[PDB]
Design an enzyme around this catalytic site. Structure first.
Site, PDB file in Angstrom:
ATOM      1  N   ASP B  56       1.268 -31.341  -6.146  1.00 42.88           N
ATOM      2  CA  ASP B  56       0.558 -32.586  -6.460  1.00 42.88           C
ATOM      3  C   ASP B  56      -0.813 -32.339  -7.046  1.00 42.88           C
ATOM      4  O   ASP B  56      -1.503 -31.421  -6.609  1.00 42.88           O
ATOM      5  CB  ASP B  56       0.405 -33.457  -5.190  1.00 42.88           C
ATOM      6  CG  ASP B  56       1.739 -33.753  -4.513  1.00 42.88           C
ATOM      7  OD1 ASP B  56       2.740 -33.033  -4.760  1.00 42.88           O
ATOM      8  OD2 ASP B  56       1.815 -34.712  -3.717  1.00 42.88           O
ATOM      9  N   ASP B  84       3.538 -36.222  -9.067  1.00 43.84           N
ATOM     10  CA  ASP B  84       2.310 -36.758  -8.487  1.00 43.84           C
ATOM     11  C   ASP B  84       1.064 -36.308  -9.283  1.00 43.84           C
ATOM     12  O   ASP B  84       0.183 -35.612  -8.766  1.00 43.84           O
ATOM     13  CB  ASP B  84       2.224 -36.441  -6.977  1.00 43.84           C
ATOM     14  CG  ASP B  84       3.087 -37.387  -6.128  1.00 43.84           C
ATOM     15  OD1 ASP B  84       3.950 -38.130  -6.670  1.00 43.84           O
ATOM     16  OD2 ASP B  84       2.894 -37.411  -4.891  1.00 43.84           O
ATOM     17  N   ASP B  87      -2.669 -41.445  -9.631  1.00 43.70           N
ATOM     18  CA  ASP B  87      -3.120 -42.125  -8.384  1.00 43.70           C
ATOM     19  C   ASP B  87      -4.198 -41.376  -7.590  1.00 43.70           C
ATOM     20  O   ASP B  87      -4.236 -40.154  -7.576  1.00 43.70           O
ATOM     21  CB  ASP B  87      -1.952 -42.432  -7.430  1.00 43.70           C
ATOM     22  CG  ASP B  87      -1.149 -43.660  -7.833  1.00 43.70           C
ATOM     23  OD1 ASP B  87      -1.687 -44.562  -8.519  1.00 43.70           O
ATOM     24  OD2 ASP B  87       0.034 -43.738  -7.419  1.00 43.70           O
ATOM     25  N   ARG B  88      -5.066 -42.125  -6.912  1.00 42.94           N
ATOM     26  CA  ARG B  88      -6.006 -41.559  -5.944  1.00 42.94           C
ATOM     27  C   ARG B  88      -7.283 -40.971  -6.568  1.00 42.94           C
ATOM     28  O   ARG B  88      -8.378 -41.338  -6.167  1.00 42.94           O
ATOM     29  CB  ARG B  88      -5.307 -40.497  -5.087  1.00 42.94           C
ATOM     30  CG  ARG B  88      -5.401 -40.730  -3.598  1.00 42.94           C
ATOM     31  CD  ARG B  88      -4.083 -41.044  -2.934  1.00 42.94           C
ATOM     32  NE  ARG B  88      -4.342 -41.944  -1.813  1.00 42.94           N
ATOM     33  CZ  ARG B  88      -3.523 -42.167  -0.791  1.00 42.94           C
ATOM     34  NH1 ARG B  88      -2.350 -41.541  -0.695  1.00 42.94           N
ATOM     35  NH2 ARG B  88      -3.892 -43.022   0.146  1.00 42.94           N
ATOM     36  N   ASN B 116       6.911 -39.177  -6.455  1.00 44.52           N
ATOM     37  CA  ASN B 116       7.088 -40.555  -5.955  1.00 44.52           C
ATOM     38  C   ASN B 116       5.984 -41.506  -6.450  1.00 44.52           C
ATOM     39  O   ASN B 116       6.134 -42.707  -6.379  1.00 44.52           O
ATOM     40  CB  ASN B 116       7.176 -40.593  -4.426  1.00 44.52           C
ATOM     41  CG  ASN B 116       5.907 -40.107  -3.775  1.00 44.52           C
ATOM     42  OD1 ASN B 116       5.408 -39.043  -4.133  1.00 44.52           O
ATOM     43  ND2 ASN B 116       5.354 -40.891  -2.844  1.00 44.52           N
ATOM     44  N   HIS B 117       4.880 -40.959  -6.939  1.00 48.31           N
ATOM     45  CA  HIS B 117       3.805 -41.769  -7.507  1.00 48.31           C
ATOM     46  C   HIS B 117       4.010 -42.054  -8.985  1.00 48.31           C
ATOM     47  O   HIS B 117       3.286 -42.876  -9.541  1.00 48.31           O
ATOM     48  CB  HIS B 117       2.434 -41.114  -7.301  1.00 48.31           C
ATOM     49  CG  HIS B 117       1.939 -41.193  -5.895  1.00 48.31           C
ATOM     50  ND1 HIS B 117       0.871 -41.982  -5.527  1.00 48.31           N
ATOM     51  CD2 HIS B 117       2.375 -40.592  -4.764  1.00 48.31           C
ATOM     52  CE1 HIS B 117       0.676 -41.871  -4.225  1.00 48.31           C
ATOM     53  NE2 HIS B 117       1.572 -41.028  -3.739  1.00 48.31           N
ATOM     54  N   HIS B 166      10.210 -32.676  -6.123  1.00 47.99           N
ATOM     55  CA  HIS B 166       8.997 -33.196  -5.531  1.00 47.99           C
ATOM     56  C   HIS B 166       9.067 -33.392  -4.022  1.00 47.99           C
ATOM     57  O   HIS B 166       8.191 -32.902  -3.292  1.00 47.99           O
ATOM     58  CB  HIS B 166       8.588 -34.511  -6.179  1.00 47.99           C
ATOM     59  CG  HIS B 166       7.320 -35.060  -5.615  1.00 47.99           C
ATOM     60  ND1 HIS B 166       6.084 -34.496  -5.884  1.00 47.99           N
ATOM     61  CD2 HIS B 166       7.095 -36.071  -4.740  1.00 47.99           C
ATOM     62  CE1 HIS B 166       5.152 -35.159  -5.220  1.00 47.99           C
ATOM     63  NE2 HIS B 166       5.739 -36.116  -4.515  1.00 47.99           N
ATOM     64  N   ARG B 213       7.214 -42.225   6.592  1.00 49.74           N
ATOM     65  CA  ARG B 213       6.600 -42.823   5.411  1.00 49.74           C
ATOM     66  C   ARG B 213       7.214 -44.153   4.975  1.00 49.74           C
ATOM     67  O   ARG B 213       6.603 -44.865   4.179  1.00 49.74           O
ATOM     68  CB  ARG B 213       6.655 -41.863   4.222  1.00 49.74           C
ATOM     69  CG  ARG B 213       6.238 -40.434   4.530  1.00 49.74           C
ATOM     70  CD  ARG B 213       5.673 -39.842   3.265  1.00 49.74           C
ATOM     71  NE  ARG B 213       5.703 -38.391   3.186  1.00 49.74           N
ATOM     72  CZ  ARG B 213       4.829 -37.702   2.463  1.00 49.74           C
ATOM     73  NH1 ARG B 213       3.864 -38.348   1.823  1.00 49.74           N
ATOM     74  NH2 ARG B 213       4.908 -36.384   2.386  1.00 49.74           N
ATOM     75  N   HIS B 240       4.658 -32.914  -2.349  1.00 48.69           N
ATOM     76  CA  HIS B 240       4.754 -34.229  -1.685  1.00 48.69           C
ATOM     77  C   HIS B 240       3.914 -34.308  -0.409  1.00 48.69           C
ATOM     78  O   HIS B 240       3.264 -35.313  -0.174  1.00 48.69           O
ATOM     79  CB  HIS B 240       6.242 -34.579  -1.417  1.00 48.69           C
ATOM     80  CG  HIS B 240       6.484 -35.975  -0.940  1.00 48.69           C
ATOM     81  ND1 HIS B 240       5.896 -37.080  -1.520  1.00 48.69           N
ATOM     82  CD2 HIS B 240       7.294 -36.451   0.042  1.00 48.69           C
ATOM     83  CE1 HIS B 240       6.301 -38.173  -0.891  1.00 48.69           C
ATOM     84  NE2 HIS B 240       7.149 -37.818   0.063  1.00 48.69           N
TER      85      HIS B 240
HETATM   86 MN   LIG Z   1       4.625 -37.369  -3.298  1.00 46.61          MN
HETATM   87 MN   LIG Z   2       1.419 -36.745  -3.550  1.00 44.83          MN
END
Ligand SMILES: [Mn+2]
Ligand SMILES: [Mn+2]
Ligand SMILES: [Ca+2]
Ligand SMILES: [Ca+2]
Lengths: 582, 295, 356
Positions: B56, B84, B87-88, B116-117, B166, B213, B240
């Site tokens: 990530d 990933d 994001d963030r 997943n992002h 991932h 999650r 992940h």
């Molecule tokens: Mn992830």
């Molecule tokens: Mn991640």
């Protein structure tokens, strides 16, 4: 003087695009030249004054241009026409353009006749000093020193009054700005006005509630002490300086340490001995690390400027014992600040004292846990080398160099790599071949690419010191051996080394001793090596003779253009065309 | 004229290395070209070694530059990213654009998998939507990138033996062939095999459990072994999950977790790591701290 | 020279208009009125005959001297509008010349009052407010602050033609006649935005003097702003003159600037407001000392809530990523405007509620 492009430049002063606005502003000299003095006065300047710009680069560039516009507005008789646009710029939100505007007003002031200063410039300073926003009062501060010398006594007294008002402004930002200009204003006043008017102001600001204001009083100290007779200093400057040195704010104590050498020069050798050395010792023992570090950084300069008659003794009895303490300061920044200047005391103290008293401190710092400390020692051997043989320290430097070279943290490894050429020149080619070569070769296979890259770049610098013959004898074979490394990251490094080595080893060594390996690597099983073969042939090609390019390089590149990998085809093609082989 | 576009792409890459976004139209164009490339790639994208495997990044552009300082520059070193990208962090835009610009410029030198992002719904809450809106003033760039994410391969297989993805394993997949039969070309579902590949986590519990999650599963050592032996694998390599060490072995080394965003969100305090797989597939790990920015 | 570069600076303004046709139209419009005198009730019609938006009717009546006796003769009205038409070449110039003091060429806060009075008396969205009252006066003050907030980008207190031209204010004046719901005009005239603003003030001014101090202001939004920041409001960083620095009190008008700046920190005006507050020494850069000074209080506040604060160094690193300054070692006004997350930057240093 073809006028149409100039009419376009004028038009683009108000274009939607900043880039065109900027271009026009930067060519204002060209525009004014073509307009002539009359029109630059009657049209160009009001036009500029009424345009709002909001972009720093444009405002900055405008303020700068106006500072140069004297001749372009018709000489000194008309300089005052530049005041109104500059007065606005000294008033905008962005501090940086305000500063540029005062810089330009300061430049333009010298073009004003004394009566024009009184009629035009001084009223501008008054309007700024009386402004509603602190921001215009801040600008005013930078403007007193340029107009004071050349006006009448009556105007001088007003300026002194206006300046006193700024020093006691209800807004701390303004007091700060005045504090910062006190020194330069003092440099233009009559000596008895310095005594009766500057000292009270200096003393007030020195005891301000804001430490931002208080800390600026140490620089004013420097300037005031420079102007004043030596025998007036104990009365007029020292009590304020002594107060600054033990101020409750670490930031002001810091400033006295930061400015310590300047204070030393202004105050003179006598006051330095009786007042400054005890002060210096206190700074070195300060409760705050930042102050001890700033003090530590000054030990060399301070010791260096003591009078000849007291120098050795005060160093030995007063400064050295403090320095010994500092070598074991709990704070790393303090130890490393000292490390970077400490051996500069070597020539000041002579051979015997160096060996007996400095050498233990040198060795201790060299064995220090903190890499920054050891790096600072290792990179400042030039001074100790004059007094003691640098070759006499080799046995202590070696384990320290090795330990840094293999440090777990790669930025530490990078730091020592960068000092390697310096170290190689000071220690000599013989010591280098014996003890350091293997260290330099090991970095070429470092896990961290940045280290490999720095190590390949290190070799170039080594060749520049020691020559292409030494390279062929001691470096190149180990470089080519990596071409057989099972890891492609390492095989590429061979090609990267060849890239930089061929810039310095010359056509013969490159042709006979480096090129055959490049060509051989074109058959490598990994595509990344194969396309870096192409890239290398492009890179080194211009060191190679046209016949070589034709008989050896071309056929390999041609083969590479028919590879199954897209990147090797592409870079082979690029190589062929930039080398004119297609 | 393929010459000219190559030159253009090199400058995009150069501009992106100075941390400067591309324009909306350049992004639009870059994404059309990437879709055309990704559409030819399999749900189990075959990758040859040598390659460096990364987890990530989450818009930590300055740490992505640090990663390149450790592993080497594209295209000289081959990379496999496990998703990933977005994001963030504050530089999701510059981060994904750099990576897809590299994929478009050097399609054999770099593999980018879906995380997943890279999903319409997750980016809308975890920062990427908002970043694109601030930087472009409308929602188009976001649309172009999220349409493109649909085309990102779900897993890779390096040299027949190292399975990279991932998230992790799914109780709806026994074989790589079951992965190849999926239709990847859609938004990530809330449940099913596709979801699990991008959401699941390895566990200390045995068998399958339900992810804490809220999507996918946990799987234990016994699951990783059954899956590997059945599929002729040496190792499942995945991302992940934040791990304090940057990488972490589990399940008697049937699984490794690699996470490449150091000090995640300025809070988590982790090292980052990457995994180099050399010319004969031997592994080695490189751990790193956040890049300094000092001033 | 004087041929190739034609004249480009017009002190006047440049451009075409048939003034006599406008005069003629004004004249036949006044011919509809008893004694050819217009009342304020007739000024809608007059406004239209001049080709102006309806809500220029107040400024037009006032400019002509109408309020003195409550009517204005055709001759006097014509005299002043001819003068406007002859010397003002766009709406912004026309509007300023109607409201301004003679030879000013700029608008001060007081100049807007006759306009706003007409707005309050005329707009169907504001009919409950027609009478003289506390709310009537506060609304006027509040709208005017919001006009200067958006338009007077120089902070000079004098709105200029150039500034008017660069804003959306006149467009909004025009829209007044198209929107019966005054809350649809969110930029200046919104009644509900005024109401929120006045309530926030009202509940701090517990003695009702129209004056608020640092203790009062500290109570705002459950003490959401740090004390070190509250203090800076009273420092002279954001107010003209010496009164605030000496008294440690601000007026209602000043509070409107504070509240609008605090509600929305992404705005060029608000970024300037908070930068002035944060730049303790006024040197144009936020220094490490200046940031730390605010941040230590944030830490002591997060502590009290049993939340663990980021250490200063981790926070500083994040903030440098967030703002991405032009030059290292200095965070500047320009950096804060360009970064687009100035609100997040500011809340981190002085607002607990909003940082979380
Ligand atoms: Mn992830
Ligand atoms: Mn991640
Ligand atoms: Ca009150
Ligand atoms: Ca500052």
């Amino acid at each position: 003087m073809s006028l149409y492009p100039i009419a376009v430049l004028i038009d683009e002063l108000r274009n939607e695009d900043v880039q065109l606005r900027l271009n026009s502003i930067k060519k204002l000299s060209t525009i004014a030249l073509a307009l002539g003095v009359e029109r630059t006065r009657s049209e160009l300047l009001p036009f500029l004054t009424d345009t709002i710009y909001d972009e720093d680069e444009v405002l900055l560039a405008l303020a700068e241009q106006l500072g140069t516009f004297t001749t372009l507005v018709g000489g000194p008789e008309y300089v005052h026409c530049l005041l109104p646009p500059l007065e606005s710029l000294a008033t905008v939100e962005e501090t940086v353009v305000r500063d540029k505007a005062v810089e330009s007003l300061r430049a333009i002031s010298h073009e004003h006749s004394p009566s024009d200063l009184e009629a035009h410039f001084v009223p501008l300073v008054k309007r700024l000093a009386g402004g509603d926003w602190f921001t215009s009062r801040t600008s005013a501060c930078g403007l007193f020193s340029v107009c004071y010398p050349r006006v009448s006594s009556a105007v001088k007294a007003e300026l002194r009054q206006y300046f006193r008002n700024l020093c006691s402004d209800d807004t701390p930002m303004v007091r700060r700005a005045a504090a910062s200009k006190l020194g330069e204003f003092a440099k233009v006043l009559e000596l008895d006005n310095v005594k009766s008017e500057i000292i009270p102001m200096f003393s007030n600001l020195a005891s301000d509630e804001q430490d931002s204001v208080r800390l600026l009083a140490v620089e004013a100290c420097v300037n005031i002490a420079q102007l004043l007779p030596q025998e007036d200093l104990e009365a007029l400057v020292m009590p304020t300086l002594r107060q600054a040195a033990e101020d409750k704010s670490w930031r002001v104590r810091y400033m006295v340490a930061d400015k310590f050498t300047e204070l030393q020069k202004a105050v003179g050798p006598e006051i330095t001995k009786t007042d400054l050395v005890p002060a210096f010792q206190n700074l070195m023992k300060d409760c705050e690390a930042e102050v001890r570090a700033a003090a530590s950084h000054k030990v060399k300069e301070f010791c260096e400027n003591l009078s000849a008659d007291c120098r050795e003794n005060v160093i030995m009895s007063q400064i050295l014992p403090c320095i010994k303490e500092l070598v074991s300061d709990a704070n790393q920044h303090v130890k490393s600040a000292l490390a970077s200047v400490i051996m500069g005391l070597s020539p000041i103290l002579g051979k015997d004292n160096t060996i007996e008293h400095l050498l233990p401190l040198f060795l201790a710092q060299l064995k220090d846990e903190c890499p920054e400390v050891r790096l600072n020692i290792i990179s400042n051997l030039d001074c100790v080398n004059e007094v003691i043989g640098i070759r006499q320290l080799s046995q202590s430097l070696l384990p320290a160099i090795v330990e840094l070279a293999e440090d777990a943290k790669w930025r530490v490894r990078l730091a020592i790599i960068e000092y390697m050429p310096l170290l190689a020149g000071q220690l000599g080619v013989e010591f280098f071949d014996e003890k350091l070569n293997s260290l330099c070769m090991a970095w070429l296979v470092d896990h961290v690419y940045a280290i490999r890259e720095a190590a390949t770049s290190n070799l170039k610098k080594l060749v520049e010191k020691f020559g292409k013959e030494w390279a062929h004898a001691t470096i190149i074979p180990k470089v080519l051996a990596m071409s057989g490394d099972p890891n492609y990251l390492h095989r590429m490094t061979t090609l990267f080394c060849i890239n930089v080595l061929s810039e310095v080893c010359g056509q013969d060594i490159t042709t006979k001793h480096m090129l055959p390996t490049v060509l051989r690597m074109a058959g490598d099983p990994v595509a990344n090596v194969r396309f870096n073969v192409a890239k290398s042939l492009q890179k080194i090609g211009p060191i190679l003779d046209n016949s070589t390019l034709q008989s050896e390089v071309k056929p390999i590149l041609e083969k590479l253009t028919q590879d199954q990998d897209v990147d090797v085809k592409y870079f082979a093609q690029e190589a062929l065309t930039v080398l004119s082989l297609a | 004229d393929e010459k000219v576009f190559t030159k253009e792409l090199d400058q995009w890459i150069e501009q992106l290395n100075e941390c400067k976004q591309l324009s909306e139209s350049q992004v639009k164009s870059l994404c059309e070209k990437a879709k055309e490339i990704l559409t030819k790639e399999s749900n189990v994208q075959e990758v040859r070694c040598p390659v460096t495997v990364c987890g990530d990044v989450h818009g930590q552009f300055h740490d992505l530059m640090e990663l390149f300082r450790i592993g080497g520059k594209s295209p000289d070193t081959n990379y496999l990213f496990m998703g990933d990208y977005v994001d963030r962090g504050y530089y999701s835009v510059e981060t994904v654009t750099l990576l897809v610009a590299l994929k478009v410029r050097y399609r054999e030198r770099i593999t980018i998998l879906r995380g997943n992002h890279e999903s319409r719904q997750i980016t809308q809450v975890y920062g990427f939507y908002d970043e694109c809106l601030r930087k472009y003033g409308n929602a188009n760039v976001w649309k172009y990138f999220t349409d493109l994410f649909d085309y990102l391969p779900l897993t890779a297989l390096v040299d027949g033996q190292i399975f990279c993805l991932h998230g992790g394993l799914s109780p709806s997949i026994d074989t790589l062939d079951h992965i190849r039969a999926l239709d990847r070309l859609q938004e990530v579902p809330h449940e099913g095999p596709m979801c699990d590949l991008l959401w699941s986590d390895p566990d200390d519990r045995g068998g399958w459990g339900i992810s804490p999650r809220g999507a996918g599963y946990t799987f234990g050592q016994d699951i990783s072994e059954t899956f590997n032996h059945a599929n002729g694998l040496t190792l499942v390599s995945r991302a992940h999950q934040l791990v304090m060490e940057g990488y972490n072995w589990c399940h008697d080394r049937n699984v490794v977790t690699i996470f490449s965003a150091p000090n995640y969100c300025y809070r988590c305090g982790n090292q980052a790591a990457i995994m180099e797989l050399d010319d004969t597939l031997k592994y080695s790990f490189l751990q790193f701290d956040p890049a300094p920015r000092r001033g | 020279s004087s041929q190739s570069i034609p004249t480009f600076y017009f002190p006047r303004g440049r451009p075409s208009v048939n003034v006599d046709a406008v005069i003629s139209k004004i004249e036949s419009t006044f011919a509809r009125f008893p004694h050819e005198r217009a009342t304020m009730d007739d000024m809608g019609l007059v406004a239209k005959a001049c080709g102006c938006p309806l809500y220029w009717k107040g400024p037009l009546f006032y400019g002509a001297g109408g309020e003195r006796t409550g009517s204005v003769s055709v001759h006097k009205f014509v005299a002043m509008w001819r003068k406007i038409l002859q010397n003002c070449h766009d709406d912004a110039a026309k509007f300023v010349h109607l409201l301004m003091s003679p030879g000013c060429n700029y608008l001060v806060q007081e100049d807007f009052v006759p306009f706003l009075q007409d707005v309050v008396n005329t707009h169907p969205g504001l009919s409950f407010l027609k009478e003289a009252s506390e709310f009537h006066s506060r609304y006027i003050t509040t709208v005017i602050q919001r006009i200067f907030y958006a338009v007077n980008r120089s902070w000079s207190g004098r709105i200029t033609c150039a500034e008017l031209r660069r804003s959306s204010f006149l467009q909004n004046v025009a829209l007044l006649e198209e929107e019966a719901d005054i809350n649809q005009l969110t930029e200046f005239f919104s009644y509900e935005h005024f109401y929120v603003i006045y309530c926030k003030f009202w509940e701090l001014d517990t003695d009702h003097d129209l004056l608020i101090d640092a203790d009062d202001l500290a109570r705002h939004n459950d003490h959401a702003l740090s004390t070190k920041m509250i203090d800076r409001i009273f420092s002279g960083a954001v107010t003209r003159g010496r009164k605030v620095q000496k008294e440690g009190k601000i007026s209602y008008a000043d509070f409107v600037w504070f509240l609008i700046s605090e509600e929305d920190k992404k705005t060029p005006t608000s970024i300037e407001y908070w930068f002035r507050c944060m730049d303790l020494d006024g040197d144009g850069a936020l220094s490490m000392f200046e940031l730390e000074y605010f941040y230590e209080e944030q830490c002591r506040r997060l502590d009290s809530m049993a939340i663990e604060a980021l250490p200063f160094q981790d926070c500083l690193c994040q903030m440098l990523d967030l703002v991405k300054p032009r030059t290292e070692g200095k965070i500047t006004l320009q950096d804060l405007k360009r970064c687009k997350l100035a609100n997040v930057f500011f809340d981190t240093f002085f607002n607990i509620e909003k940082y979380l």
